[PDB]
Design a binder for these strands. Structure first.
Ligand SMILES: [K+]
Ligand SMILES: [K+]
Ligand SMILES: [K+]
Ligand SMILES: [K+]
Ligand SMILES: [Mg+2]
Ligand SMILES: [Mg+2]
Ligand SMILES: [Mg+2]
Ligand SMILES: [Mg+2]
Ligand SMILES: [Mg+2]
Ligand SMILES: [Mg+2]
Ligand SMILES: [Mg+2]
Ligand SMILES: [Mg+2]
Ligand SMILES: [Mg+2]
Ligand SMILES: [Mg+2]
Ligand SMILES: [Mg+2]
Lengths: 66, 177, 527, 52
RNA sequence: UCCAUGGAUCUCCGAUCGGGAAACCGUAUCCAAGCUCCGUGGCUAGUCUGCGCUCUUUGGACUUUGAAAACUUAGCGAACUGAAACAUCUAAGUAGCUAAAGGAAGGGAAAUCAACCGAGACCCCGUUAGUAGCGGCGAGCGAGAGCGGAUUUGGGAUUUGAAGAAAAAAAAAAAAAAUUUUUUUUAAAAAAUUUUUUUUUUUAAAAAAAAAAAAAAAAAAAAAAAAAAAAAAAAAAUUUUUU
RNA sequence: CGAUCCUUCCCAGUAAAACGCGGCGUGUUCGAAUUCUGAUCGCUUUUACGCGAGAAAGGGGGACCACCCUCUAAGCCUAAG
């Protein structure tokens, strides 16, 4: 069994931030959930991560271009 | 046996029977759990409907039968809650753990499970508390800031910290003096 | 490609309003603005979809609605008589920071007026300035449109006194609406005094103004005054309205004047556009009650020569029965084909009345031709229809068809009629006689079984001809079967039929069956 | 006059539904159960057929 | 004396304010409001005001449900005994202990039966039948469906009007067959009512003006008042009106 | 007062399955099925999300498969006997 989770930061062997990955249930439940390294892949948290990353990455892009 | 009726009696007595319309009474009967929960420790945990079974242990050659029991796979676990930002220490079955994994956390399990499936007055309390906390967060927003505003705020906190540390040093000097 | 509002409305039309549909719609929309919400609300296939979208978009925090969005919601909520919805939405607008405008209130007043709940229109007209909003001109006119339609006339007088008290100039609309209410509510001298008050202000009457006067005088049963008002109307160098001449024809149809309606019909060539649907809707009952036919067939041709359907669809059967009782049979098929070609589904009465009219005058063959396509299209088994085939419409034709040939289509027609409501004794007896004389008395026996199953009482003579049709064809065993059915029914035959039955059994070699007939005539003592 | 046939109201309510199927029908690619259960539909059919 | 109705008084335990060897001991709860009496303090000293308790009234704060035979639904659950011993089996989900609910509870309108014919929620009574089936295939245990009765019931989700270039149809002309086939041109004409008060006109008769309402209880809740004539109270010019 | 809808429900950790018991349920594991702006194909419109067509979901009927019949689970309420 695996759980689909959406990463909030970059993890070395997993993937980049905002990307959905599959992890062991104990891994997410006991490490990634309390440290806010990943959220469960449901629609409310997917929407939250997508829109907040859109705002922050848009601010970073607008700062980086000029 | 008739757990819905005895829990309804407590609910009516606590709230007040004058506050309740007939249609609200009909609705509240549909929400109060009435599952067959007998064992005392299940009323204090989150078992998701698992309950101890009693049956026969059957010998191999003779077929002799003696009474045994089947116990649920209960573990005391700390489950992280997003809306309280802390761990909640609950006696759960592993079946309830698997249901919570499917739901996406203890908060989402409490939000999505209907009132009748909570099986327990304490489960009703926790579901009500998490629903109220999520309703409070549902009327809020956060504003974000430009990187130059972020730099100004970083410098503002730095000046506050330096003022606090110099005030502490001067307080130490004056209490020494 | 596609726009976004029509696929949003397709989404709300095809799927239940769940949370995942809302999430799909929210992920579908890249940017929120007022025009998107306006075109979604305009394009919604149901009102409940529009209300769900309007509440979800203001409760999700995705947008804050503006004045025209609230206006559209209140307009279409009151147009479908969801009055508390539009009241409660309007009563939350000060708290949203969106200022009240007068036009929202006057739409809500019209909404309460369409439901005939004019008391609330009066109340909210009073409570405009209590809430602190302008009440200048349109609110008065629509309040009058609401309350004089109900028939409040002295309240109209007082409210027009308040209308002229606080320095607001009346327009032609205000006087026309109160004039319509006063002429409607049987106040002659009041409406003439208000006409004088209109003339004191010196605003020029127009086509609608003279139309209101001729409507009022036409309901006064005073047509000479309407004609002299039309003389005054022509004297004022104004173009003739179609509504004015239609009102003339309505007043011409008080008792007789179909020919005056003809005479002013050629006066439309100074107007320009003749064929409105309401004139054709209103001219037929006068000629139908009068009994005038020659100048009606040509304009029945003309109304489909200009593609016009009447406002009332029951006018076709009225003209059918009047024109058939006149005697023009061959134009009744033209009326049937016109009914089939405009919109109207032909019902059972539209064929049945013509079947009766054809049967009463020696024209049975094309009646059979009509009945064939009536059976084939199965109009009798239609549930939408209101006009059903009357007992006058099948009792003579079943008599003819059974007495003069085929009883197969007679029993087909009556079996289609039994499924609707019909268990008439005369038609079933006619089927019995027809099947007996056609050489098929088994069908008469099964019709008698239908009588026994359906609770219809049975004759004693209908058994006699069944028995003798068995005996003529050479089946006396079936004759004894029918005799048993007759005795079990409770009727006793005559000794001549007993002699014929016993002889036909004896010369057929059926000794024991004849012995049973002999025993039953012992038990009944009939010779 | 409504108690001679008290089943006309149910029949008028379910007339458009009863054309879709016996137990259910397909809508938007998925199977959907019928609005009247099979035993109640059978009772309605018996009431219709006992009156011819 | 007695009866009917309504009142006054109305010790204690069980027992619930705390303790407790049941019928005893200890108990001014606590806190906002406004009122007569009470006492003390302070002003420029008069219908002067500002601080208090005790007890009275109305509230709101803690918390006190609560008993009860059998029936019901659940949890746990024997052994003697029978099998001519005994271990599967039987006794028996019985005895017992425990919990919760109600005057009844429970069940209940088919993811049910049938067999290609059809039935039509649930429970109770009769029958099928000690049959089918289960079983050291031993001892024993033992249906269902159907049929006959009793009661006879279904309701809801749940429904919906969908407000007014080319194809087709209808008119006029044309040809042919015994009506038919083909081509050519085309704001309003519906929205229905009654009471009361005042001032006028007009031949006591009936209509004119301007003032207040009700033709709402669709939906439920809150409040005032419960039918004719007369007595008293309050307001007004004891008396009238209302109550 | 005013024509009264603004939500207990999102609905699968379910049905089934393996082992153990049992009053068809239950302990431990585990785990589906058709649509989530339906899809596919054809048509005009001549460059639609219209019009038509076909096939698509589950349970049961003494292991199991095919066909047929019948029903629609995974919490609606309900008198009397
Ligand atoms: K034993
Ligand atoms: K023995
Ligand atoms: K022994
Ligand atoms: K019940
Ligand atoms: Mg005590
Ligand atoms: Mg023994
Ligand atoms: Mg037993
Ligand atoms: Mg017992
Ligand atoms: Mg009890
Ligand atoms: Mg009781
Ligand atoms: Mg009951
Ligand atoms: Mg029976
Ligand atoms: Mg099977
Ligand atoms: Mg089988
Ligand atoms: Mg069948």
């Amino acid at each position: 069994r695996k759980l689909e989770v959406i990463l909030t930061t970059g993890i070395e062997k997993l993937g980049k931030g905002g990307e959905t990955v599959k992890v062991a249930p104990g891994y997410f439940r006991n490490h990634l959930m309390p440290k806010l390294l990943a959220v469960p892949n449901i629609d409310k948290y997917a929407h939250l991560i997508r829109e907040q990353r859109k705002m922050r990455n848009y601010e970073e892009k607008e700062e980086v271009k000029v | 046996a008739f757990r819905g009726k005895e829990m309804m009696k407590k609910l009516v007595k606590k709230v007040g029977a004058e506050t309740l319309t007939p249609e609200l009474k009909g609705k509240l009967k549909a929400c109060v759990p009435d599952s067959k929960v007998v064992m005392g420790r299940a009323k204090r945990g989150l078992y998701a409907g698992r309950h101890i079974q009693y049956g026969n242990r059957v010998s191999e050659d003779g077929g002799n039968k003696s009474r045994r029991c089947w116990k649920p796979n209960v573990q005391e676990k700390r489950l992280f809650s997003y809306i309280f930002d802390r761990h909640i220490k609950v006696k759960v079955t592993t079946h309830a753990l698997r249901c919570i994994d499917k739901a996406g956390g203890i908060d989402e399990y409490l939000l999505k499970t209907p009132y009748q499936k909570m099986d327990t007055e304490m489960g009703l309390f926790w579901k009500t508390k998490v629903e109220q906390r999520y309703a409070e967060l549902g009327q809020m927003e956060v504003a974000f800031f430009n990187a130059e505003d972020e730099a100004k705020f970083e410098q503002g906190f730095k000046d506050l910290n330096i003022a606090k540390k110099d005030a502490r040093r001067e307080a130490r000097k004056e209490a020494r003096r | 490609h596609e726009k976004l509002e029509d696929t949003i409305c397709r989404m709300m039309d095809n799927r239940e309003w769940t949370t995942r549909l809302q999430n799909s719609i929210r992920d579908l929309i890249p940017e929120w603005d007022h025009s998107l919400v306006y075109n979604v609300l305009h394009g919604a296939k149901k009102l409940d979809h529009a209300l769900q979208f309007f509440r979800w978009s203001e409760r999700s925090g995705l947008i804050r609605h503006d004045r025209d969005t609230h206006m559209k919601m209140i307009e279409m909520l009151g147009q479908g008589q969801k009055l508390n919805h539009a009241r409660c939405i309007l009563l939350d607008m000060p708290e949203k920071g969106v200022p009240w405008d007068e036009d929202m209130f006057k739409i809500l007043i019209e909404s309460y007026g369409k439901a005939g709940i004019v008391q609330e229109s009066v109340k909210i007209f009073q409570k405009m300035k209590e809430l602190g909003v302008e009440r200048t001109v349109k609110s008065y006119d629509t309040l009058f449109k609401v309350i004089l339609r109900r028939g409040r006339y002295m309240m109209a007088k007082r409210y027009f006194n308040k209308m002229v008290s606080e320095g607001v100039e009346p327009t032609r609309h205000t006087y026309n609406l109160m004039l319509w209410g006063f002429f409607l509510c049987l106040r002659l001298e009041t409406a003439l005094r208000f006409y004088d008050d209109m003339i004191s202000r010196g605003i020029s009457p127009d086509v609608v103004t003279y139309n209101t006067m001729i409507n009022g005088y036409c309901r006064f049963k005073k047509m000479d005054e309407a004609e002299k008002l039309f003389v005054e109307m022509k004297g004022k160098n104004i173009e003739p309205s179609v509504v004015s001449y239609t009102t003339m024809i309505k007043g011409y149809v008080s008792v007789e004047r179909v020919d005056d309606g003809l005479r002013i019909f050629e006066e439309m060539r100074s107007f320009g556009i003749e064929a409105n649907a309401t004139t054709y809707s209103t001219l037929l009952p006068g000629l139908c009650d009068a009994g005038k036919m020659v100048e009606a067939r040509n304009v029945l041709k003309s109304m489909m020569a200009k593609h016009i359907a009447p406002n009332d669809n029951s006018i076709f059967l009225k003209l059918l029965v009047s024109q058939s009782k006149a005697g023009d049979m061959a134009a009744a098929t033209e009326v049937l084909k016109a009914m089939a070609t405009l919109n109207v589904p032909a019902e059972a009465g539209h064929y049945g009345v013509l079947i009766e009219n054809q049967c009463k005058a020696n024209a049975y063959n094309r009646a059979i031709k009509l009945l064939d396509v009536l059976v084939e299209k199965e109009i009798i088994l239609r549930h939408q229809d209101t006009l059903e085939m009357e007992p006058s419409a099948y009792n003579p034709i079943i008599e003819y068809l059974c007495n003069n040939g085929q009883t197969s289509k007679a029993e087909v027609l009556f079996r289609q009629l039994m499924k609707r409501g019909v268990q008439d004794q005369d038609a079933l007896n006619n089927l019995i006689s027809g099947h007996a004389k056609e050489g098929n008395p088994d069908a008469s026996y099964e019709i008698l079984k239908i009588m026994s199953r359906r609770g219809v009482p049975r004759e004693a003579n209908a058994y006699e001809l069944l028995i003798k049709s068995y005996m003529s064809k050479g089946e006396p065993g079936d004759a004894k079967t029918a005799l048993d059915s007759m005795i079990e029914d409770g009727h006793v035959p005559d000794s001549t039929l007993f002699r014929s039955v016993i002889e036909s059994l004896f010369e057929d070699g059926r000794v024991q069956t004849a012995s049973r007939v002999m025993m039953i005539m012992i038990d009944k003592n009939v010779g | 006059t409504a108690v001679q046939h008290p089943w006309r109201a149910k029949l008028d309510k379910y007339r458009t539904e009863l054309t879709k199927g016996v137990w259910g029908y397909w809508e938007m690619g998925a199977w959907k159960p019928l609005g009247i259960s099979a035993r109640r539909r059978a009772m309605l059919r018996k009431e219709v057929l006992t009156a011819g």
